[PDB]
Paper text:
In monospecific diabodies, two identical VH-VL protein chains form a homo dimer. We determined the structures of three monospecific and three bispecific diabodies by substituting the arginine at position 83 with other amino acids. Note that the diabodies we used had substantial sequential diversity in their C”D and EF loops. In conclusion, we have found that substitution of the positively charged arginine in the EF loop greatly reduces the ambiguity in predicting [name] structure.
They are constructed by connecting heavy-chain variable fragments (VH) and light-chain variable fragments (VL) with short “GGGGS” peptide linkers. Therefore, the two VH-linker-VL chains associate to form a dimer with two antigen binding sites, each consisting of the VH and VL fragments from the different chains. In order to investigate the structural flexibility of the Fv interfaces of diabodies, we have determined the crystal structures of 10 mono- and bi-specific diabodies with and without bound antigens.
Author numbering:
A (entry chain O): 1 to 106
B (entry chain I), D (entry chain F), F (entry chain C), G (entry chain D), H (entry chain L): 1 to 229
C (entry chain J), E (entry chain E): 116 to 229
I (entry chain P): 1 to 118
Amino acid sequence: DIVLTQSPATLSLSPGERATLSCRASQSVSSNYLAWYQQKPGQAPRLLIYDSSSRATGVPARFSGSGSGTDFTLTISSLEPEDFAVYYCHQYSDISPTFGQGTKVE
Amino acid sequence: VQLVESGGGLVQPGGSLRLSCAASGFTFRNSAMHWVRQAPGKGLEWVSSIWYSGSNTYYADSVKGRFTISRDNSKNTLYLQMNSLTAEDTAVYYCARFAGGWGAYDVWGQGTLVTVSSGGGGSDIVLTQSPATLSLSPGERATLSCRASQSVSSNYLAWYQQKPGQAPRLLIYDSSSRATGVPARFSGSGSGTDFTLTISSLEPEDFAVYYCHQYSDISPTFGQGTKVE
Amino acid sequence: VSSGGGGSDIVLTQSPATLSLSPGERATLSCRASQSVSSNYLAWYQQKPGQAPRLLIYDSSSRATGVPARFSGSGSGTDFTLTISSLEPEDFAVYYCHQYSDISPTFGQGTKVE
Amino acid sequence: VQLVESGGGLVQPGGSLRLSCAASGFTFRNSAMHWVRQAPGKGLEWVSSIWYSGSNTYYADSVKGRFTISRDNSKNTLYLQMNSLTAEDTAVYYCARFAGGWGAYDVWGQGTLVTVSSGGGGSDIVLTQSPATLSLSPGERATLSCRASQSVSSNYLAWYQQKPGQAPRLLIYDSSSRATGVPARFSGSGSGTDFTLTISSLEPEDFAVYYCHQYSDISPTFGQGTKVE
Amino acid sequence: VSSGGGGSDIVLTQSPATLSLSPGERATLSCRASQSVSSNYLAWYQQKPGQAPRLLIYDSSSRATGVPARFSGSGSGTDFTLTISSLEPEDFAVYYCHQYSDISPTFGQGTKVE
Amino acid sequence: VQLVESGGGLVQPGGSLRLSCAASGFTFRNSAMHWVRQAPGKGLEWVSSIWYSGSNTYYADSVKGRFTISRDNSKNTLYLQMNSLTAEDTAVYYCARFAGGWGAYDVWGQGTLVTVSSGGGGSDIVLTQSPATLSLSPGERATLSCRASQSVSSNYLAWYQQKPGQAPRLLIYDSSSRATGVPARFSGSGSGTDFTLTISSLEPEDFAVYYCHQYSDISPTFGQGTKVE
Amino acid sequence: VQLVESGGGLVQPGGSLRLSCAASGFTFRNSAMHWVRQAPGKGLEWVSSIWYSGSNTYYADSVKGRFTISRDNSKNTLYLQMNSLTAEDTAVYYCARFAGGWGAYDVWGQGTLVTVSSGGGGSDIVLTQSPATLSLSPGERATLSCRASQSVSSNYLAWYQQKPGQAPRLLIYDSSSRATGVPARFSGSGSGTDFTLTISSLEPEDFAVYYCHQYSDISPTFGQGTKVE
Amino acid sequence: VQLVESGGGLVQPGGSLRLSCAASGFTFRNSAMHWVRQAPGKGLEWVSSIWYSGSNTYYADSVKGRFTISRDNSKNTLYLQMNSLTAEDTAVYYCARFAGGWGAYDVWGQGTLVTVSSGGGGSDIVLTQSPATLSLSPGERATLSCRASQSVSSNYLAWYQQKPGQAPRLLIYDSSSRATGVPARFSGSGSGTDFTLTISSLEPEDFAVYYCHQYSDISPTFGQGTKVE
Amino acid sequence: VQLVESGGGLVQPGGSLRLSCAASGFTFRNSAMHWVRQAPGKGLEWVSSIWYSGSNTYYADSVKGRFTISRDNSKNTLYLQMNSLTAEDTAVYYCARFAGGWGAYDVWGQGTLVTVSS
């Protein structure tokens, strides 16, 4: 059962700075079937990245996903106030989908 | 009941300046007179005091040995002689009458700005590190940011590690060059005004304060540090 | 570089660092000393941008001459309070507390009322 | 490429001060050098200009006759001699190299504050009149208010009428006393900090500017005026 | 008391006096001259509180060395514009226009971008 | 080319209303017709769309299940049936012809005001808490203020503590009575229009939002809260 | 002494819902019972009240004609029937026992969330106009910016001018085409996500509020407007 | 103590509308009830009154014969039946309780807007004449301006002279064509939105009011007149 | 392309509740639909999944034997029947379309809070 561990748990940054988020799996993620979601207070999660590196429709270029195997990273090039939220990674390579515990960017 | 201050201005480091404060409306010859200063964007800070003949004159550790408070009671005038000035003396200086239990600092001069600087225009390259703190576990990745207010020519930017009680240790120079004996898990990147230090998989010995440093001009500056705990 | 002893000046801590209020509202400012302030020799000053500090309260509760009655101080020992009962538009400034009970005068770091 | 300023400070009205600006990094002997000042919370204002051998110095109308710009090319230094100073000269003064079509003011000094004051912070009683303007018709009543920041001792407050091009006339003194020759339709009242001038039935000759005036201390002050049109 | 004014000085009027914007948005600043500015000798400066002005644009359209490309000037004669394409948090400051086409240099009164 | 509107007015919550829009000067039967509304002081907001037979009709999310757009091409008339009206539906409603790439909303009706209200005031007792936010450390004292627009009879004023995700908890009632189980560090005081809650020594569990509450009449009102963080 | 709440959940606009509250530990039939709600992120707001056999029941103005409070004393149960639900009703609802002078709201239910929504989003194109306010003189140029969160296909963007009390007026469509009768001093430009409206020489009749509008999909959206004053 | 108003909206000229006002909190059967209206941007204007059934209902001359005030004391409701509506009836209508010596209009409804109009979202062509007044002597030149809010098609603009107590007389039509019998000293010019009437040498018989008039559409409008004195 | 969710609320322990998710803008009959929940202050947690006829429906161990996922393709509606509720089932529940390699959870319902308490 693939465990996803995100780090750091909390990132305190200012507008204009870059946020680098890490998702590390206990096993290799087949086909790089890993996704990133953004969730703001009181709202449903919203897809940012899928297939490790594919940017969803409508997602600004400032969001970028990379990595493979067991090490994945989400990078936000220039943080805006609407980017401060909690971010979850998600692997869908097997029959037991699992999520990271989230990284809150504040 | 007034204090008319004069003096101040812009002076080079190591220079001298004399402040004066002319009193009227009270028995100046008997009054305790103090100097108080206020650095730009900071709070009030006591500087010196002088009183009757028979009492001690007092100075703050910041100025004792360089500043001299004095008074000429025949002209109802208070003086502050400022010698061997340093950039840390930059502040607005106030003369004030001290009334103790009868009013504390009840009369203030209007204040005069003393700026101690050899600089020009004129802006040193400011380095801002982000985030201020990173809490991580062994094995995880640490990504540190250093952004400069101006372009760092030739990418002359270095990264140092400092553990408590020890001298800084060179990790990266020329933005991307790993120093001899530094493990390959340390790597730097970036150019111009955007630089990054990455520690790929943290070890328990990597928890320390990390500083970036630009040496592309005659005025070297450091970032304020990122603590990885 | 120091002339003092193992000794420790009386440290004044003001709270909160900032207060955002409207005209007519109450402003309550706190000053907290690390040691007891002998004789309650604690003063409060008002400072507006670009101007010299102005005495509001001395001896913890004594209102300076010309200060409106809406300003009032209280407390003793290590716990002091400055109260502005109903803020006026001329009251928005930085406020400092100040202890003069010993040889080493010290100030609080200020509370901004905006 | 640097301009190192020095001088400035706090001086009393009518005093004198000299500012200096030491240049480095360029051929100072070829450069046109200007002084620019900025009053607190105001915009930039050109002060003076100087150029090469054929000395062709220029001044702003505010300072012509009081300020003298000069230069010593052997010390690469620009000077500004400031005489007959007034509170209107209070500003941060910048030296600047003028490059014209090749950079305008491309190099600036850091600026030094010059404050011209005799100790003015304000114990004076401030009088506020309201409203600033009143549009009324003949036969109507005009009610004018004067408010003091502090209590006016002994109710030493007066009211004056001023028509364009003429000296003021005493209307009311001691808050309520009608001056000799003033028609009964004028009347004053109030005490402490709240005063009123009432014109019971306006006449066509009553349309003018009205000032209140407190003389209860040694710093006399006037209201800023109410125009009755 | 006057020295002969006045006068022939080219009057520069900046508009608006204030612009309230967010990071990422466009700032468009206007400078209007009372008379034609010969050779388009018009400059733009940025000034942050407590600091000396910084040259941004000269000769109406020339971006000074080290100024980011998001700053751009345009216009001619009596109508000039400074454009900040996408505001950064360090771009919030007061901006002045300046004409140096004659012996009496004049400045606009500034536009504050907050 | 004109759109002539009719209908609207003032109705109570839960009521129903029908708007009309008669067209002339164009081929109405083929036109895409929309409704757009604008709350007082707010911007324009699209509401509904209708077009040719064989197309879909669209509604804004907020009005779906409440509003019905329709048309009668024989009478060149557009309709909007408005049901389940609430205060959020108060707006000026416009009918407009949608031209797409040939003019967007190129023709507008003059608009009719729809107001949904069960009353006109307003005269409730308004409680104003201050300050909105208090950043304090453990061990410090929090002084919270609650000011009423009118006198609170019998001093029937309560204070509540609410933590995130939990129901409010009674702290003080009758202005000064501590509820059973509330620690002695909390204390209420005041009367008439001026009430205060004082937390003498903040514990970590004391950081929450605090509301005042007057229950002196048939229209209970709360303050908007003070967050002690 | 407890109140056990039940009901709530997610419904669509125009829907209905009933909340329940079962009491225990006190003589319920003698207690006044209230409903209080708290919208997400906002404060507490009273909703309704009910009391003894001669039920004189009260409602907040917003819910009058939509909500009904009732009680079944044989079951010790409080009810709140909620009809004509809209998005402004989204809140956490609490039942509470009202003790008046002996405890105010001394007993609370744990609260149930009621959310009124016809769909998750909300995934529309967001138009952001800049700046919100422009203070300009006649003859000056107004440059208005409209930024889109996504690319506006076909550059289907329009601008409207609205004066107080009047319907909007089309100025520009297809990003840059002037509507018939619009003077040449108005001009639109831009593509993709960045659009501007420029009024070259402001006339006195040009001071109004200007809106941008994208019509490139089935969810038309507007900017919140720029006021040119 | 409340009056809940309802009704109003946008209606055609000659149409009908009924306003209602439901009272609570007082003995409605004994109270005198009035209607008051307020035209857009105007002051308050009394409309009608009703009292006990032993007194007479009263109406203003503006509405007498078309409006009917009535009451149903069993429902605590006040009514205003508005028949034969005209654009002059456009106003916000308030119901109000009249207390005479015990409170005048102490309770008001919130008001509902009644707009009586047959037009679309476009405005008629507005003509603005300037100056409002010209004081001249015989032999001098009078230059009068007429500016239109929209372009006047075909230059269909006319000028009229009106002397006191007499019908207007045609001076100029088609902007520049001098009417039969008009002296050559009258001449008109201009096109589009800018028109001028010039009287080359004033005679004493030329002192009158002058109106411009556009007839380029189905909605004829006049300027507000320029008086030549 | 949206999912309109409904249902939820406050229920006693051991009670029952049915959640609904109405789809539009895509071929719902062919889509894999999941339920995901998030207890207050915690992270996302997969609950259940349903797909085409001929595939297996799946449940997390925490709901297996108590929850039933189902669909009505004629009405384009997804259901979650929640029985034998416990305090640990308290969470905001989301319906979501699963696109796998073509976008993972690319469409989400807005979520509804289910609280189980007495």
